Each structure stands twice: as structure tokens, then as C-alpha cells.
Amino acid sequence: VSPPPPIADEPLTVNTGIYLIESYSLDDKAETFKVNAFLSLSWKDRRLAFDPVRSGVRVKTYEPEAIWIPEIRFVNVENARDADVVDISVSPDGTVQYLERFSARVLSPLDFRRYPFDSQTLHIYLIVRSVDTRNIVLAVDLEKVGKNDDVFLTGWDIESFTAVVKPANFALEDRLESKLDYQLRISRCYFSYIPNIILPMLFILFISWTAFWSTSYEANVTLVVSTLIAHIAFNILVETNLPKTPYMTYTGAIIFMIYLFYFVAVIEVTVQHYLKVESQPARAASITRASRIAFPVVFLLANIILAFLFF
Amino acid sequence: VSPPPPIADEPLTVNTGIYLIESYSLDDKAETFKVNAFLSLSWKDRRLAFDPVRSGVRVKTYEPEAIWIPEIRFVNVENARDADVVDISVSPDGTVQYLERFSARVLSPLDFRRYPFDSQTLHIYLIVRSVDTRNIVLAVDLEKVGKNDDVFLTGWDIESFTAVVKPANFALEDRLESKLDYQLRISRCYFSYIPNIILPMLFILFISWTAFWSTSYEANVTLVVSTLIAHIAFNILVETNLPKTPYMTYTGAIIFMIYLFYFVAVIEVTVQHYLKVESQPARAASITRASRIAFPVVFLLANIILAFLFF
Amino acid sequence: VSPPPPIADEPLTVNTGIYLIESYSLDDKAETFKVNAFLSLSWKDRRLAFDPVRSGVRVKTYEPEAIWIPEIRFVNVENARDADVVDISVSPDGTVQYLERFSARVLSPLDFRRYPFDSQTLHIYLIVRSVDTRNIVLAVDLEKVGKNDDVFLTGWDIESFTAVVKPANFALEDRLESKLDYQLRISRCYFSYIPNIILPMLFILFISWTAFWSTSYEANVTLVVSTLIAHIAFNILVETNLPKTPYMTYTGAIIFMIYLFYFVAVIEVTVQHYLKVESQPARAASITRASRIAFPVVFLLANIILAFLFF
Amino acid sequence: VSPPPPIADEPLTVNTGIYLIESYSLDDKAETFKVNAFLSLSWKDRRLAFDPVRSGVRVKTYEPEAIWIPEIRFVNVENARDADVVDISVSPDGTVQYLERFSARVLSPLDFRRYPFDSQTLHIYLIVRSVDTRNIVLAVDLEKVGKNDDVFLTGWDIESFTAVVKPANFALEDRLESKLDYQLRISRCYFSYIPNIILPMLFILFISWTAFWSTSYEANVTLVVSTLIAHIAFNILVETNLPKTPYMTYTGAIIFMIYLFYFVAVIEVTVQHYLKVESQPARAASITRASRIAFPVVFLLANIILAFLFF
Amino acid sequence: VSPPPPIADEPLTVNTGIYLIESYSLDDKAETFKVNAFLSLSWKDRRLAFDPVRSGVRVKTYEPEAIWIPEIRFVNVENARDADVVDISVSPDGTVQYLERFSARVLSPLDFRRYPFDSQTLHIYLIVRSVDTRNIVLAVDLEKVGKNDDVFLTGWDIESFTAVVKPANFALEDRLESKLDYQLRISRCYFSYIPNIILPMLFILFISWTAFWSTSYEANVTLVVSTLIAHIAFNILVETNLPKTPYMTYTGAIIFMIYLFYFVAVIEVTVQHYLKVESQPARAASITRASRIAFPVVFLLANIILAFLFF
Ligand SMILES: [Cl-]
Ligand SMILES: [Cl-]
Ligand SMILES: [Cl-]
Ligand SMILES: [Cl-]
Ligand SMILES: [Cl-]
Ligand SMILES: [Cl-]
Ligand SMILES: [Cl-]
Ligand code: NA
Numbered sequence A, B, C, D, E: 001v002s003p004p005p006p007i008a009d010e011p012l013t014v015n016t017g018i019y020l021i022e023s024y025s026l027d028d029k030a031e032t033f034k035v036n037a038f039l040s041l042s043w044k045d046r047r048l049a050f051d052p053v054r055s056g057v058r059v060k061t062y063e064p065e066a067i068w069i070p071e072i073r074f075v076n077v078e079n080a081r082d083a084d085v086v087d088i089s090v091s092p093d094g095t096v097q098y099l100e101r102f103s104a105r106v107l108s109p110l111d112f113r114r115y116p117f118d119s120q121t122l123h124i125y126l127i128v129r130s131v132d133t134r135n136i137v138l139a140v141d142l143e144k145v146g147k148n149d150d151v152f153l154t155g156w157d158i159e160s161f162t163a164v165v166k167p168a169n170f171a172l173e174d175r176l177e178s179k180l181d182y183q184l185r186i187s188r189c190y191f192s193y194i195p196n197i198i199l200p201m202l203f204i205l206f207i208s209w210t211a212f213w214s215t216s217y218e219a220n221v222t223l224v225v226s227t228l229i230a231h232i233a234f235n236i237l238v239e240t241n242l243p244k245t246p247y248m249t250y251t252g253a254i255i256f257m258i259y260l261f262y263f264v265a266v267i268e269v270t271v272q273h274y275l276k277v278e279s280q281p282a283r284a285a286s287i288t289r290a291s292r293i294a295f296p297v298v299f300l301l302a303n304i305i306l307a308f309l310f311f
């Protein structure tokens, strides 16, 4: 079997559509997501045309092997899609209507800069390669692009599923390629990060600041060092859920900054003890009283600056 | 091969049934479960009708390729089911009896609000897409819906496996779709959560309250900070067994609330020490004595309020 | 191809045998194990009978497609077995000898009540479904049931591999089903649990009891709280190797009980300090001296009671 | 297709060879390793004899389905090998030369007694079952046994890859079996265990011994209990990399013994404090001074004894 | 089908090219990476030559089964590549142009000596085994070697993808083998290691040095032992992301060295306390004051020495 011949010297237009049935397994570390969807294809093959009267049929059904079908592939997939043909219908003018249901693991880069208050644009790139006989170009049938109402992505909110209607036509290995961009816009469900990571992390930090109302060096060392260790645990927990980035994430910036607060609190606790041993407590008292205001104030201003730089 | 023709203009009814053989791997984080079952299908094909007197045979056995079989699919599966045809039997009137044994990974959302005292309704959605020649509709043969007595789902109690007899008939990509809802009702085995998470978490909290019978600041700081760290460990352990939710779970609410109790206990321990250093121990004594009653009382009332809001 | 016709009115007897080549991956949490074995099948098909003199052969070798073969399945498997036919041999009287080598992941429930001193009976259920033409029944050829001497299951001792010779015949969807039970008896290698979990857990508990020979409240708080935290670590380690059970395991019972010992030790340490602060040390001394005997004695008696209830 | 006929009453000899291309994934806990290799087979089939004059060609190339090929299997594999035929060459006398490239996961037991200074002999067992028409026997073509120079097994040193030339011929399920033993000798790269586990474990133990130069009970309790907790962490880390064994490993013996040293150090610290409180410090001083020598000396002698028993 | 015959006695040249579409899953512990690419092949088959004026067609499209195709394999792959033929084009002179899209898991050793500031050269080895009729040699078509602009490897920077144009021709099991080396040069994104591992590790070490400004033994023991435990946690975290190496890594060297600093700090804290108890504080003061300078100075010089030895 060979591609449909051109009346005149035009490319063969293959109309496409993707209808999402299921969206699952968004892996942050791997920067992948799994998809289960319908892929619809449509093109004109004059060689398959028929007269309805003498045939007695308004439509003709074919097996994929019986007719010419364009070799449509996904660019950003781990392995080739698992596909099963649902229907192949031919109308009198030879207009072919192809429908398959597929499942695929899609590679799509993620921007973690605003994590866990981040939004992403996931991409599904559809592609066709031209043949020596003729050039094959892709188009979007907007009536056949969509998603099931029940489509849910655990830990995320699904905003939209749209297609960039104009294909990216270019040369690859001395043959022309026609590429379409299907976009799935999602926003992260940040809720759980507040009672599980953010507030526990703030509680332990505020607990370390009780050392500014204590003259007991031994108790102060215990307060600041113990809470620091708990902060290390939260830092480790956060970085296990994320890939390594050449940039700072919003959460990563806060976590890093809190180390500086623990480090300066240790210096204060040391300075206070040293002065008291040196029989200079009036002075140590001035530093401790200033610290009671300075630590929460600098923490608030530094957080306003960070939120501003990131959002 | 083509679908059976209508005698007058009626849709083709495909009678269905699912008989569960095995239920395994309920993954909370992934919101999936694996199933091994029998799928039974039945429809009338007059083209296959025969005379039992002349044929001498009461039933005819066919290979799937020899006859027309409806394209039945599962909506909420990761990948297409792994199926093997067991039997195809045709009665003299042309009624076809199809039986296959399949295994599938099913995606079904879970409500964690009442965790670990939660119940779930797992769904298996059966679907058929209508052909151009005629509309295909699904039905439930209640005599072919069930489960093996030995069916067990580790960590859960299986209540029932029933089917919603009325299909959801709708248009999808300019064709009719007939959808059936098979429901597997389960309730979580909460037992082990009591000696492993709930009681150890309560023991460490009550240990922190022994600081209300101690005047030693250094020992009090050690009591409240050490038990807080153990509470952080249990919080981390709990959230690893669960996906991220846009709501609070029952356990998550208790765990979060216990942080406030540790935070206020640190304030009390700090206030007590501060007053004693300021030569005001009579006053510190009043706060400490009140705390001995206030902390268990407020803990009990807050838990009654939470249990009421969640159940 | 169709089943062998009955001479009279008798069911077709299919003689079976399983010879274990490899046993691996016993997953406690999943309640599964992997198996690699030979499956042997034998039945009488008179249509295949031949005269040795006329044919010039004493045995006839066929391909699976050439002859009728019973559809034998495993009940308790995750997915269908990976099988490869080794040989098919027909004797002059039509006695067929079938041999296949297979691999399968088997679901078999485990009783963790006596963990890690538990024994299990793993099951491999062989099944056949009867055809409209005739009833198929399974039998055990004891001469073809066994295991390779080198068969080892890491962390376990293999006791026996036997078959329950009488099948469980029952109706499923108006057809006779014949089920055979192949049993693999195993006992857990508890050795490593002694130096890795049991003795370290006892050492830290005995270390907490040194507080009964100390008047230092601050050192006592450090002794009991630090060892409790180490006990939490061991509790977490143990529950990660096990699924959630609606019952207490032997190890789980000991682990739970040890929390009560830590809790009462904290009360003793608190009571002792309180009395000494109240200028009542003679009294605190009586409680501390009694605790030195009471704690090891109650620990020994409670363990005797537990061992008795579990074994 | 059937096996080659015997001239006179001899078994069919199938010459074998395995050439290792890649060795990877040695899983200690699973006791498996993955292999990618060439499997070469050679046998005489006179029914394939040809005249180069008549056929034109000096060597005939066949497809596996066109000719009789011996059913060669691996004994100790999880699933059947992933194989791809590279060549099937038939010479004029009927000598067949078969070459396939395969990949397989091999189950081979490991002896952890000397871990991490252990060596292993991994096995790949080749097998053939005899047919009714004639007995099949395996042989080793030493010219076709080997490994690529670049073959590396991460964390191990590869010593040799040889074959036991004499097959193990035996009866199994009333037929002959011919088994060959291919051996891959490896030795563990112990280097990294020294700076990562052994020396950090020794440092924390020696830190606990500083308590023998301190009279401060509260500081001593902190020294011995904190380092013990760090030792528990290392014990847990080590046992996660290893399966459960019915014997003690070398590392496991040292780790277990170090607990006794921590336990006796706690007793010493308790005894010292008790005597000082009882106004007997001269006596406490004698025990502490003896401990300074006894602890490192007994540690050295116990380690010499252990190294001797294990190596 | 058989290979193309030689005009004179020249080997058959198969021109190759690899065009990377996707690069993902660089596993450090496994020393593997996944690839999705185009594999292009080109050779001359005179038996396929045709007249362009007579045939009408300028290029002829064949199915893989219709023509002879060289058996091209990858040396360093876990399992055989997942390949799908895109196009086969024959020019009038008989020049065949083969194109397939494949996905493969590649084994390629990694040098961790400079981790996390390391660079790697990943290899993809293409190979062909000669046939009895003629020798097959591989060549690089540089015009068909490349990578998509969007190719990204999470946690790494992709530098170049080039091929060593000269094949490695050698004898293996009495037949010629032609091997090509495709090289993917990458450099690690070290950024995240600085705020997540390096700086937190330095902060805790500097916190341990505050003990040189404290006379309180009990507080000093708490400072040095607590920070040491946090250092153990970071050592464990680092070694989980890496395989076991027969050499020291840069990070591993620093981590190991920091243990010596903690060990000597404990000695200093012990010596200081011992002298003060012995009524020699003027001397303890000299050692403590020297330590304030010695510890940061020796730390800086040791790090300069290490950086010099590794880079
Ligand atoms: Cl694809
Ligand atoms: Cl399906
Ligand atoms: Cl099966
Ligand atoms: Cl019955
Ligand atoms: Cl029946
Ligand atoms: Cl095999
Ligand atoms: Cl390959
Ligand atoms: Na086609």
C-alpha cells in the first residue's frame, strides 16, 4: 500500500484530535506523566471512494492492514504508545475517519521555581514524517480535542487541554516533519504543604527563639541544637520529593534562610554565656533583649523580600 | 465480519457480568487496585442461528476470529486489560455466550477524610462505542455478577461487589457510548493503627506533660523538645502512606493539633522559668498547677470536637 | 478441535503434576511468592489411538495446535502464567502426555500471629472449567509431583511440597469446575531477628532501668526519653517489613508492651523528683528500691504470659 | 519437524558456549544478577546435507522455524531468557551452527559469612531434556566460552568465567536431562565500607570511652546514650543492604559485639555515679582507671578472635 | 534472502547515524541511562537497482521482510532495543536508506571521583557481525548524527553527541565484528548540592566550634555530639545517591575528614574538663585559645590540599 496521490501538487492534510480519558502518575523527580486517550485521524483517499446507490452502503469499514494509514508518532514519549484501533470509517468521497485508544508515558519538563505554589504546561507533541511521493502535514480538528469531566490528576488541578492549531513544519534527516503541540495546563494543590511542612517548620523555629528569654546556657544549647536537627529532617524530606535544579525553589530559599537564623541564634547564645562568665551580664542582657525583637522582625522582612522575588 | 443486523430498529443489547477471582494491590498514594476476574458477554446474532435436529449439536463452539464480537473496554484502567478467551458458545436461536478471564490495574479515586477509619467505593467502568451500522447498549446479567469467597484485599474488608443495572448512555465524538458501573465496597482495617501510631503518639504527648510536675527548666526543655521530635517522626511516617490531599484527614487534624500542645507547653516551661529567675515563684506555681488540669481537659474537648466534625 | 467423546457418560479425567524448579521472592507485605516449575498433564483421547505395527512407531509427537488440549488455569495468580510447551506424546491407546515449563506470581495469604517464629502453607490452585460437550475433572499423579533438591526460598526453610489428591468440584456460572490444591509448607528463619532486633531492643530497655540507681532527675529524664526514642525507631523498622493486620503479632505485642514500661518509668522518675523537691526523699527511696525489683520481675512474668498466649 | 536420526545407538551431542557481553544488577537481598550474552549451539543433522555444486552456495542459512532446533533452557532463571537469533548456518555434511544473543535474570545463592570481604561463584545452568526418539546430551566447546574485556559488575571484581566440561546427566519425570554448569567467579569491592561504615562506627565508640576521663554523670549519660543511638542507625543501615541469614556475618558479629561494649559502659557510668553519691569516690576511681585500659584491650582481643573465626 | 554480492572482494559498508530525540533516567547507582532516538542505516544492494525512465518511480519503498537488512545490534544495552521501522527507500543505483525509531536502556560506566563536580562520557556502541558470504563493516554518516535542541537530562548539562568515525574491527568466535562508538558528553548540575548538603554540613561543623568559647563541659558534650549525629545523617544521605566505589569521591573525602574534626573536638572538650577538675584551668585556657585558631586554619588548609588532589 502507498500514500494517496495528489490531485495537483498539494500536501496530504491529516486532521488530528486527542480526547483525554485518564491522566495519572505525575512524577516530579522523573518529569513524566501517564495518559490514556483517544487519538482521532482524518484524511482523503480518492482510491477508496464509492457511489452510495450501487454499493447500498453510506459508509465502509476497513481493517488497518487493508488500507494506507499515516505513520503518526509522539515526540516526547518514553516508549512507543500502546494503541488499539477502535474504528476506521470511509465516506463516499473517500474521507477516512480513524479512531484509536492509546496509553503513553510522556516526558515534559517542569519549572519548580515557585514550588509548592507552581503551575505547569504539560506537552504532548504529535508528529508525521513526509514520504518521497508526497509531503504529509498535520491539522487540528477542534471538535475532536477535549477531556472527560472525571479526568483527575492526584495532587493537581487540571485547568485546560488545548492544541496549538498551527503545526511546526521542519526538515529532519532530509525529510520534512509536521509537529503539533497539545497542551495540558495544571496547577499544584499546595494545601497539604501548610499543616505538614510549613507550619511544623515555623513552630520549631519559634521554639528556638524561647532561648532569648533564658539565661541557662545548657538549656539554650538544647533548644537551638535540637530544633536545628528537626529543621535538617524537614530539609531532607522536601529535597526527596524534588529533582536537582540549577536554580533555587521558593521552599528551598526559605529552608536555606532558616539555617542562617539557627546559626545566628547559636552565636547569640554563645555571646550571652561568654559575657556572663566574664562578669558582663548587663551587656549580655542588652544583646538578648535586642534579639527578642530583631529575630522575628528580620524573619518577617526577609520573607516579604523572598515572596516578592519569587511571585 | 460485521455487526448483527436489526430486525426493526432496535439497539444491540450486550449483556455483561464480572466475577471477581482475585483483588490485590490497593495503592493509596496511586489510588489504584489490581483485579483478576471473569468477564462474561451475551448478545443475539441471528446469522449464527441453526437447527438443533439436523445439526445433531445443541451448542456450537467458535474461535473469536470466526464470529463478530463487540469491542468492550474498561474506562478507568491504566493500560488495556490482559485477557484470555475461555469459551464462545452459540445456542440454536443464535444467542452467543462469551467468557474471558482478565487482569487489570484500575484507577479509582479515594476519600481520605476519615483515614484510617475510612470506607471506599471502588469503580470498574465497562464501556461500548456504537458502530455506524447500529447502536450498541450494555446490560447487567445479575446471575453472572459476583466474587469468589476467598477474595481478600490486604488491609481491607470487602463488603460488596454489585453493578448499577442502568447504563449511562451518552454521545462521545459524534457516536453513542454505553457505560456500566461495577462497584466494589471496602472498609479499612484500622486495628493496627491503634498500637502502632495512635497510642505511641499519645504516650509521648503525656510524657511531655510530666514537665508540669517539675521545676527543673533544663529537664523540662529536654522533656518537651525530645517528645516533639518523636511526634515529628510519626507525622512524617503517616504522610508517607498517604497522597497529598486538598483537605484535612482525621489523623492529619489530630497530628496538627498536637503541635499546638507542644508549642503551648514550651511557652509554659519558658514562662515558669522566667518568673522563678525574676523571684516570682508563687505566680509560676499558679500557672503550672492550672496547666496540670488545662492541658488534658483542652486535649479531651478538642478531640471530641474533631471526632464530631469528622464522623 | 473438540474434547474427547465419552464412551459412556463419564467425566474426562486430566491427571496433573507440578515439579518445582525454582522458588523465590516471598513478599510478606504483598502476600505473594514467585514460582518456576514443570506442569504435567495426562488424559485419554481415543481419536488419537493407533496400531504400533501398522504405523511403525510406539509414540506419536504432536504440536499443541494439532490436538485438543484442556484449558488448565491457576486460580490464585496475579497474571496468567508464562508457559512454554516442552513435549506432547501419544501412546498407542490414545493416552496423551503433556509437559510445559511455567513461571507465575502466586497470591497466598500469610498468618503473621507468631512472627518471626511463624510457619506458612503456601497454595497453588490448579483449575479446569467443563465444556458444553463434557465434564472435566482433575486428578493428581503423585509420581509427577515434587521439587528440585536445590530449591531454596531466601529467609525461609522449605518443609514439603505435596498435593491434596481429591479435587474441589463445584458449579460456577452453570458449569462444573474442578480445583486441585498444591501445598508448599515453609517455616521462617527467625535467627537474624535475635541479634538485630530482639537483643538491641532489650539492651536499650535495660539501660532505661539504670535510672532506678540514680537520684539525678536531669540524667534520668535523658536515660528514659533517649531509649524510648530508640524503641520508636525499632517499632517503625518492624512495621515496615509487615502488612497491616486485624490482629496482634507476637513481636508487635512485645513492642507495644515495652511502651508501657517506658511510660511507667517516666512516672517513677517524676514521682521520685517531686518527693525529693518536697523534702520527702526517704519515701522516694522506697519507691525507687521497689522499682529495681518490680520492673524486671513484671517484665519477665508479662513475657511468660505473652509467649504462652501466642505459642 | 523431528530430531536427527542416529546412525547407531548414540545420543545426540549438542555443543554449547556462552560469551558474556554485559553483567549487571547483582542484587544481594534477591540473590540475583542480570546477564547479556551470546549462546552458541552446534549439532549434526544429516537430513540437511547438500551439494555446494547443485545449490551453488557453500553454507546454507536457515530461519529457526524451517529446521529442527534443540530445546535448550536455563535452570536457574526467574523468567525464560529474552533471546534473538543472530545466525543459523548449515554446512554440506549437515553440521548446524546456531548463534543467539540473550538477556536473563539469574537466581544464584550468595554466602554472606565474610561480608563485606566475601567472594562468590555465580552459576548459569544450561539444560536439555531427552525426547522419545533419542537422548540429547550437552557438551562444552571451550573455544566458544568467554567474556568481553569491558565486562564490569558494579561493586565487584570479576575473576573468571569458566564451564564445568562434564554435564550432569540424570533422570527427571521418566526422561533423561543433560545439565551444564557455567561459573562466574567474583570478589566484593570492600573499599568504600571502610570510610563509610567501619571507621565512623569506631569513632563514635571511642567517643563513648571519653566518659572514663569524666566524673560528670549527666555528661557521661549523654556521651554513651547518644553514641549508642548512632550505632543503632549504622546497624539498621547495614541490615537493609543484606538478606536475613541463618548465620552471623562478619560485620553483623562486630556490630552485635559493640552493643555489649555500650551496655557495659552504661553499667560503669552508673556504678561510678552510685559510689560517688555513697561517698566512696576512691573506689569509683579504681573502676574508672581500670576501664580506661580494659575497654580498648578487650575490644582489640575480641576483634582478633572474631577475625580468626571468620577468616 | 541473502546479503548483496561483492563486485570484487570488498566488505559491505553499512553507513550509520543516531539522532537523539529524548535522553532521560540517568541512574548513578545502576550506571544506566535511557535513550529514544532515530537509527539510520545505508548500504548498496545492486540486486535492487532499477531504471528510473522505465519504472516511472524515482524511489522504491520496501517492507523490511521484502529485502535483505543487516543485523545491527547495540553492545552495551540491558535488553534488545524497542524498534519500529519508519521508512525503507531504494534509489535507482540500489542504494538502500533505512530508518527506525528506537528506545533503549544503556549501560555506561561513570567516574564519581570529582562528584558532584563531575563530567561523564556516556557511550552507545553499535555493532555488526559478518556473514559467511561476506564481511560487514560500519561507517559514520556525520550528516545523520545529532540531537534535538529540546534534549534535556534532568540534573545534567548535555555538552555534545559525536561519533568516533573509525570502527573497531576485530574477530569474535571465528567471524569479523565491526563496532562504532557514539559518545554523549555530559556535566553534572552541582548547584543544588551547595544549599542542600555542603552549606548545612559546614554550619553544623562551625556550631561544634562554639565549644571553644565555653567552659561548660555538659553544654560542650551536647554541642559536639549533637552536630556529629547530624553529620552522620548527611554522610548516610550522600552514600544513598551513589554506588560503592573502589576509590574516594571528592565529597566522600570531605565528609570523612570532618569526622576527624569532630573526634579531635571531643578530645579537646575532654582535655579541657579534665584539667579544670585537676585545678589546672590556666593550661585548659591555653589549649582552648589555640583550638579557636587551629581548628578553622587546619580545616581551610586540608580543604585546599583536597581540592588540589581532586582537581
Ligand atoms: Cl508513539
Ligand atoms: Cl480495557
Ligand atoms: Cl494461569
Ligand atoms: Cl455446587
Ligand atoms: Cl456442567
Ligand atoms: Cl531459559
Ligand atoms: Cl540491540
Ligand atoms: Na496501513
Ligand code: NA
Pocket (backbone or CB within 6 Å): A222, B222, D222, E222
Ligand atoms: Na541535654
Ligand code: NA
Pocket (backbone or CB within 6 Å): B001, B064, B065, B066, B067, B068, B069
Ligand atoms: Na471478531
Ligand code: NA
Pocket (backbone or CB within 6 Å): C001, C064, C065, C067, C068, C069
Ligand atoms: Na488445543
Ligand code: NA
Pocket (backbone or CB within 6 Å): D001, D064, D065, D066, D067, D068, D069
Ligand atoms: Na524448530
Ligand code: NA
Pocket (backbone or CB within 6 Å): E001, E064, E065, E066, E067, E068, E069
Ligand atoms: Na530482512
